[PDB]
């Protein structure tokens, strides 16, 4: 009942969704395999830390 008064639209998202316990990794065509790709390395660092 109080979520609309936070101006969040309750069909586009919830307060619970702000903090993320999960993360999507983009398709490979977003980040092509060739210089030598470092975007994949940034994702690898997050995987290594977990």
């Amino acid at each position: 009942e109080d979520v609309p008064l936070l101006l969040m639209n309750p069909e586009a998202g919830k307060p619970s969704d702000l903090i993320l316990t999960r993360l999507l990794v983009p398709p490979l065509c977003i980040r092509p395999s060739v210089n030598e790709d470092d975007l994949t390395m940034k994702l690898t660092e997050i995987i290594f830390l977990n």
């Binding site: 977003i30 980040r31 092509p32 060739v34």
Partner: protein, 49 residues
């Protein structure tokens, strides 16, 4: 100088200034600059030319 027209053979009314002026050729040539693309290779990330 008194100058004659090469097209008509009749002389020109105004006298024309004539002399040697140093002229230097610059590296910018049209053969190294003409460019055209119909369709061709595209970037991998954004599929645009």
């Amino acid at each position: 100088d008194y100058v004659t027209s090469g097209i008509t053979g009749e002389p020109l009314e105004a006298y024309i200034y004539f002399g040697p002026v140093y002229y230097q050729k610059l590296k910018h040539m049209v053969l190294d600059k003409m460019h055209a693309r119909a369709r061709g290779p595209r970037a991998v990330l954004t599929r645009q030319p």
